[PDB]
Design a binder for this molecule. Structure first.
Ligand SMILES: C[C@H]1CN(c2ccncc2NC(=O)c2ccc(F)c(-c3c(F)cccc3F)n2)C[C@@H](N)[C@@H]1O
Length: 275
């Protein structure tokens, strides 16, 4: 029933502002897992389970979206400790985050970016449909199940319940944050998500993010350092509209002509990954 009984701990996979994440194995069936530790002091956002249990928001959010859809990393279990929480997540194998994948490969071919970006959109739509706002969409928070060509969202530790009124708090990644946050410390959920998705898509097809400093975010002028089709450039600049209400809805993104004829995930692994 206790934690270090149920799970054999492997090596540290990474650590940072989000806590420390370890490789692990469930002792019962040898299922691969990832084990995330977060100190209570560094959790600012605390939700409630139906049954009134105080927990990090992250646990609330992952329970809200943890089902059969494989586009979000599944929370398998969690534990409170006197000074920390521990989360057990599913772990694909082999696996690589999108940041490392892009660092290795450089700018992605458009066919590949289309497939990946499409899966990210399906995953984010599912979160929103379940009342969950991720608030830190970026290559480091997206993982690739290399054998299946399937992407998964991870790290809901900066997320929130989706609402229709203004957010005035933010602790996600600043270079993916929209100009209205930089200037006014205010944003609305969906349109801020769409801006981060513009940053991500640019990142995929150029191999780096378009803006580094506040003043570039605010100016919002996009320069393409690699050859990118006119239709892709158009979608990117739409997502990155300075006025939030000028940005496309998710439906508009998925109906964009650059988004048509997406590869299936398995086709994507065969053409682009196993190779
Ligand atoms: C090591 C990963 C940890 N990661 C996270 C940051 C904040 N919260 C959670 C995570 N990771 C996970 O929740 C998770 C769940 C299942 C996984 F399979 C992985 C994972 C892994 F187990 C190996 C390589 C990468 C992964 F994302 N991470 C950031 C990635 N930039 C890094 O890479």
């Amino acid at each position: 029933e206790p934690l270090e009984s149920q799970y054999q701990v492997g090596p540290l996979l990474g650590s940072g502002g989000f806590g420390s994440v370890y490789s692990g194995i469930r002792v019962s069936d040898n299922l691969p897992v990832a084990i995330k530790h977060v100190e209570k002091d560094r959790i600012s956002d605390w939700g409630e389970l139906p049954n009134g249990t105080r927990v990090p928001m992250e646990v609330v959010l992952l329970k809200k979206v943890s089902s059969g859809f494989s586009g979000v990393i599944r929370l398998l279990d969690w534990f409170e400790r006197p000074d920390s929480f521990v989360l057990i997540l599913e772990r694909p194998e082999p696996v690589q985050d999108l940041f490392d994948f892009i660092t290795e490969r450089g700018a992605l071919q458009e066919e590949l970016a289309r497939s990946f970006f499409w899966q990210v959109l399906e995953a984010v739509r599912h979160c929103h449909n379940c009342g969950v706002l991720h608030r830190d969409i970026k290559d480091e928070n997206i993982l690739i199940d290399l054998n299946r060509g399937e992407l998964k969202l991870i790290d809901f530790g900066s997320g929130a319940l989706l609402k229709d009124t203004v957010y005035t708090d933010f602790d996600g990644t600043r270079v993916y944050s929209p100009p209205e946050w930089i200037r006014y410390h205010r944003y609305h959920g969906r349109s801020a998500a769409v801006w981060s998705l513009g940053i991500l898509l640019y990142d995929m097809v150029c191999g780096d993010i378009p803006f580094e400093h506040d003043e570039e975010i605010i100016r919002g002028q996009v320069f393409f350092r690699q050859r990118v089709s006119s239709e892709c450039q158009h979608l990117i600049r739409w997502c990155l509209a300075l006025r939030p209400s000028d940005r496309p809805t998710f439906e508009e993104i998925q109906n964009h002509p650059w988004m048509q004829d997406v590869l299936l995930p398995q086709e994507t692994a065969e053409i682009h990954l196993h190779s």
